[PDB]
Symmetry: C3
Subunit: 98 residues, 3 copies
């Protein structure tokens, strides 16, 4: 699995903090570059973490549509059909984004 | 549409990577500032990407409530009413956050 | 509440922008470190904002499962049971991630 945890992001930034503190205490070209490096890598980690979450969210959206279809089946003939079908289409719209 | 894709974030960071590599190979005031600039802009892109996603998530939460109301209708008289109504309120709580 | 708003992230980055602009206009060791500092802090804010959102999303996933159980109850005997139960398990999988 390529899924990244929220805690994983935190731990990476804790290291970044250390580097920052070292930079502030003893400003230098080395510490500046190392600080930037860590930030650049961490930025990727954040996006990658978001990616996995978004992909999961997409599955949830699809799952939500499955509920509607099942609901409309057993609720067949009930007014709710008029509005629940509209929601399904809206979920599809969301499904195609991420 | 102002929606930003996950891939869009990646591509921006790929450019950032290039700048980092140039910085590391040839440290300089120019490369430092340019690296920082790219990071600052990319940070905005991440938040803006999150914004759109969160706004979509808010709509999903509202949509989830719509399912409950439709469900409670056809399930009227069924015990589930006691608990499903509690969920709806919880979804509302989430709806008002983002 | 420890929940952070999307707007909160924006406002922080607006300050970061100002620092960047000052850096670009007058490059200096001071502005470089201050720019990095702000970025490091803002990176934490982004992750913390994500954390709260993800935790909320987890609750939504659980809530979605509650809908299924209520649906399956009133729809008992209906074919939908075969597929809706599969979704519930998939939601559980998502619930255990974040």
């Amino acid at each position: 699995g390529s899924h990244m945890g929220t805690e994983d992001l935190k731990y990476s930034l804790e290291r970044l903090r250390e580097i920052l503190e070292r930079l502030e205490e003893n400003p230098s070209e080395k510490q500046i570059v190392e600080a930037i490096r860590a930030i650049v890598e961490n930025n990727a980690q954040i996006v990658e973490a978001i990616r996995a979450i978004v992909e999961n969210n997409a599955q949830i959206v699809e799952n939500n549509r499955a509920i509607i279809e099942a609901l409309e089946a057993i609720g067949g003939g009930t007014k709710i059909l008029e509005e629940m079908k509209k929601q399904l289409k809206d979920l599809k719209r969301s499904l195609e984004r991420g």
